[PDB]
Amino acid sequence: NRPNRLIVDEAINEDNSVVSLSQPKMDELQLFRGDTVLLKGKKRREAVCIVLSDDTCSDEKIRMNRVVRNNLRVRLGDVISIQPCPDVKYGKRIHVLPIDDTVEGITGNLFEVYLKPYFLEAYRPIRKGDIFLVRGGMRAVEFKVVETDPSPYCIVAPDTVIHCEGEPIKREDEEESLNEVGYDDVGGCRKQL
């Protein structure tokens, strides 16, 4: 019934660009270690992430973070399609912009402070229209990928000069804020959920 189709579930890893799958399933799909897999969701939108082996993962389920899930337009109990990328390319152009609500009260240069350390030596896959959260930088800032050199997705090339215009963008209605209180905002209470 197509082994590339699995039911999306929650992930134990808070990695915004990583998914978890069972070893047996990884063998069925012929996946390597840090391979770049393409996840096709709903509304004809696909996302790219790295697959990790997890024993806590079912045989018909795939674990992923909230960001990728929402950006895949899928919800809990939905089915997505996973396929290893046979041909990928480096982003010879990176156009990212900060959100208007995430720049309230601040001013100056965010390029050399945020839109650089998250790209340099990062080597992460991104798609046009994806939103990533920078937690490793004092404050958790949300950044949206406007576009890249290769459409509609590519891998972050640290050798490429990232370009961030000095004009914040507005947030869409279907795009929630990572400042929202999720399950990761609850501590201690595990079995209470």
Next chain:
Amino acid sequence: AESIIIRVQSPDGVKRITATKRETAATFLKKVAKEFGFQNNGFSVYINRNKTGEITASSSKSLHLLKIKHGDLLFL
């Protein structure tokens, strides 16, 4: 079944390199020595990110210590 679809992360892109079912580092070093024209005593094999950390800070052993999988992606 086993499928050798290993891909290498090059500055241009991540494509499927010409690899066989079995081959050693010397075999791969010889490939890049002709394809890219690199030298066996220059080309360094890395299977992880942290490109900036590769500068001196990366003194790890690419031997059985790190444990390379059958198709580990080379982050270049």
